[PDB]
């Protein structure tokens, strides 16, 4: 059995083997914009008195 | 000289000192060319916070 443990250890050092993927994140961003853009106006003749 | 003084080392150790002075160095080198140890998961676990009605 001193055969049979040094097998065990032999052929587990050599058979383990694994690759695995993580992703860690999180997706916290912000954009603020407040007074400040432009809309549109129209042509449009116009006078005061 | 560490060769040399590994061989007089090992005439005067004897035999058995040539025997496993072998073993080890296959050892070693059965193990640097296989070096690993694994773990696979599944993804869980959670923070519970639960409240109990009174």
Excluded at chain 1, 18 to 37: G, H, K, M, P, W
Excluded at chain 2, 31 to 43: A, C, D, E, G, V
């Amino acid at each position: 059995l001193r055969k049979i443990r040094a097998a065990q250890n032999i052929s587990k050092t050599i058979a383990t083997s694994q690759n695995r993927i993580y992703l860690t994140a999180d997706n916290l961003v912000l954009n603020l914009q407040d007074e400040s853009f432009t809309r549109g106006s129209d042509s449009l003749i116009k006078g005061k008195k | 000289k560490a060769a040399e003084l590994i061989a007089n080392s090992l005439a005067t150790a004897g035999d058995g000192l040539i025997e496993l002075r072998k073993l080890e160095a296959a050892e070693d080198i059965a193990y640097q060319l296989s070096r690993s140890r694994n773990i696979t998961y599944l993804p869980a676990g959670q923070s519970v916070l639960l409240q109990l009605p009174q």
